[PDB]
């Protein structure tokens, strides 16, 4: 994308420069330099074709780079990811026959704007009262990453179906990837052969474990997880599953089986779940009145959820309060007065090399020019553990 | 609509075309109530249903459970 531009390509600039250069070529014999004068039709006619040709002439190098990235290493053109959750359906009474919830059963939230559909048919055996099945969001986007017990409204009524809810908070809602993320995805394919020096970082965080997970590779870290005792020939992996929690032992087994034929013979691979540090924010800000208080709060919450994405966070790295304030201000329409994280205004260091931050609570105190104080509090995580 | 004695063949046909829909829906249905003989009254589901021998099938086959 950041490719040098071979020639100037702009309609108005082409017209102006063409008139000036026509003046220059003659020894001042052509003086109608008015870019909107009587020579505007001729110059504009030439400049239309000139721009429509130079615009494509400027694309040569980027076309070559795109062709290289597409043909010799086919890379899929990522479009997005749909959020997934686990719905539990509960019956009104114990049936003598086996209840069936059909495929593509639509559930929604209270507002009715977010809609999920069941993955497959759910068969609740006769005598049971509840049954669980996975559901996928209607469309891509981070707006479908809802909390637990949020999706409970359903339109089509089934016989004896009493309730339905989501047991897990829906996650992995992604609207797509930027150009830099696609570039990084292409480059990792260029350099991942024989994972050495924290390419284990890259082989699991987005591969062989799902999209939306995290890994942290630490060399010479034994079973004691003590840095001051290095063990040569040991690589320790710390994993956060696709759901954003410390990795399930089944996922640990899967990643171990995946990585076993790729590590050096004689070396020892250790895999353990990652750890999370909960971040609680208190924001006192002055509003410019260009947005409503609810709109400001929603924008700030969405920006912080983007900031504290485990894909955007490096495990073991301290959280910088200036960076958080910049992420908040990038929303716009507000002026930050004060920000507290974990009951202090200082940077928050991670307890160890393998701890990922995870912001959980945020309190808003927004003051406008007229003087109204809007106070609100949002809890983002299900509970302090998950 | 009102098809009189001054109508053409094409309109006579068109009238039949639109008005035969109800007769089409009636195909493979049971329009009138029937009289039948109860042959089974022991309902395993306890729903007080009975089985009948309707004259349409000539007692050759059994019918479905019929609700009270």
């Amino acid at each position: 994308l950041n490719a040098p531009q071979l020639v100037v390509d702009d309609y108005e600039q082409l017209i102006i420069d063409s008139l000036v250069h026509t003046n220059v070529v003659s020894n001042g014999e052509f003086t109608d330099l008015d870019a909107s004068g009587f020579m505007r039709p001729f110059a504009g006619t030439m400049a239309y074709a000139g721009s429509e040709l130079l615009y494509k002439a400027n694309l040569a190098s980027i076309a070559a780079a795109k062709s290289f990235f597409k043909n010799v290493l086919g890379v899929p053109e990522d479009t997005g990811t749909k959020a997934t959750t686990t719905l539990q359906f509960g019956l009104s009474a114990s049936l003598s026959t086996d209840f069936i919830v059909p495929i593509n059963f639509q559930v929604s939230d209270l507002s009715g704007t977010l809609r999920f559909y069941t993955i497959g048919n759910l068969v609740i055996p006769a005598g049971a009262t509840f049954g669980t099945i996975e559901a996928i969001a209607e469309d891509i986007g981070e707006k479908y990453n809802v909390s637990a017990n949020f999706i409970d409204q359903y339109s089509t009524p089934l016989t004896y179906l009493q309730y339905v809810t989501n047991i897990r908070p829906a996650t992995n809602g992604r609207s797509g990837e930027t150009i830099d993320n696609l570039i990084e995805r292409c480059a990792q394919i260029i350099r991942i052969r024989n994972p050495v020096s924290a390419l284990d970082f890259e082989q699991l965080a987005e591969l062989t474990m799902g999209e939306g997970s995290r890994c942290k590779a630490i060399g010479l870290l034994g079973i004691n997880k003590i840095v001051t005792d290095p063990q040569p020939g040991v690589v320790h992996l710390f994993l956060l599953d696709v759901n954003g929690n410390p990795a399930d032992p089944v996922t640990i087994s899967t990643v171990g089986a995946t990585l076993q034929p790729r590590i050096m013979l004689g070396t020892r691979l250790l895999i353990s779940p990652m750890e999370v540090l909960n971040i609680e924010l208190e924001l006192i800000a002055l509003s410019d009145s260009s947005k409503t208080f609810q709109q400001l709060a929603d924008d700030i919450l969405e920006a912080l959820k983007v900031f504290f994405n485990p894909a955007n966070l490096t495990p073991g790295e301290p959280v910088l309060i200036e960076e958080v304030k910049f992420a908040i201000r990038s929303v716009g329409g507000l002026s930050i007065s004060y920000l507290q994280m974990n009951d202090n205004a200082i940077n928050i260091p991670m307890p160890n090399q393998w701890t990922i931050p995870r912001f959980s609570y945020i309190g808003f105190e927004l003051t406008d020019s007229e003087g109204t104080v809007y106070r609100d509090n949002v809890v983002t995580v299900t509970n302090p553990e998950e | 609509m009102i098809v009189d004695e001054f109508s053409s063949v094409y309109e006579c046909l068109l009238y039949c075309y639109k008005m035969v829909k109800r007769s089409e829906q009636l195909n493979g249905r049971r329009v009138f109530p029937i009289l039948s003989v109860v042959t089974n009254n022991n309902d395993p589901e306890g729903r007080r249903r009975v089985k009948i021998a309707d004259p349409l099938f000539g007692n050759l086959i059994e019918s479905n459970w019929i609700r009270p």
Binding site: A93, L95, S96, T97, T159, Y160 | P44, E45, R48
Partner: protein, 50 residues
């Protein structure tokens, strides 16, 4: 929960059982005594040394 349930506890009894669909059917689950043929009668067994 028992205290709350006892408030709206009825006294009527149901002869049928719920089912999801009208087409679906379920079989019987209990073997109920219907009538008493004989309070005390003599009986013998056949098929043994016969």
């Amino acid at each position: 929960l028992a205290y709350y349930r006892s408030l709206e506890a009825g006294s009527d009894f149901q002869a049928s059982a719920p089912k999801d669909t009208t087409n679906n059917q379920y079989a019987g689950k209990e073997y109920k005594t219907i009538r008493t043929l004989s309070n005390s009668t003599t009986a013998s067994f056949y098929g043994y040394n016969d």
